[PDB]
């Protein structure tokens, strides 16, 4: 329960850090935000920059990269499966990553409701800002 759940959150944080470094490299080299091709999932857009591509989050859900306004966003989950978070998992993720990054909804233009330290997520797609311009 408690310790396993905290380590699943830490695993997403490690994936986030690795993907963020690779994304910044791609952005510096191409002058364009790396995005998953329309109609696909996964991080193969970053394959030149990563020895091993993260596939699924330990909290549930496949990874992909989307543009939301001017921001690069790590999407965690798809139609098939979203993330699951207890309040304690949400609290750790926010303590470690900080504010204005983790969202429970987006449109193509705008970040939606921010995750809070009291939020439970039951099989829903989650969003973490990687690059804020």
Numbering used by the authors: 8 to 140
Give the article text.
TFP are the most widespread type of pili, and are uniquely found in both Gram-positive and Gram-negative species.
We use the structure determination of the major pilin in type IV pili (TFP), PilA1, from Clostridioides difficile as a working example. Our attempts to determine the structure of a PilA1 construct lacking part of the N-terminal α1 helix to prevent self-polymerization are used here as an example of molecular-replacement approaches. Despite collecting high-resolution data for R20291 PilA1Δ1–34, it was not possible to calculate phases and an interpretable electron-density map using our manually edited search models based on known pilin structures. Previous knowledge of the biology and structure of TFP pilins, particularly the presence of a long, N-terminal α-helix required for pilus formation, allowed informed decisions to be made during the structure-determination strategy. ARCIMBOLDO uses a fragment-based method and harnesses the predicted secondary structure of the target sequence to place fragments as search models, in combination with powerful density-modification algorithms such as those implemented in SHELXE, to provide an initial trace model. As our example shows, using a careful approach to molecular-replacement pipelines and exploring available options, combined with prior knowledge of both the biology and structural characteristics of the protein of interest, can lead to solution of the phase problem and the determination of novel protein structures.
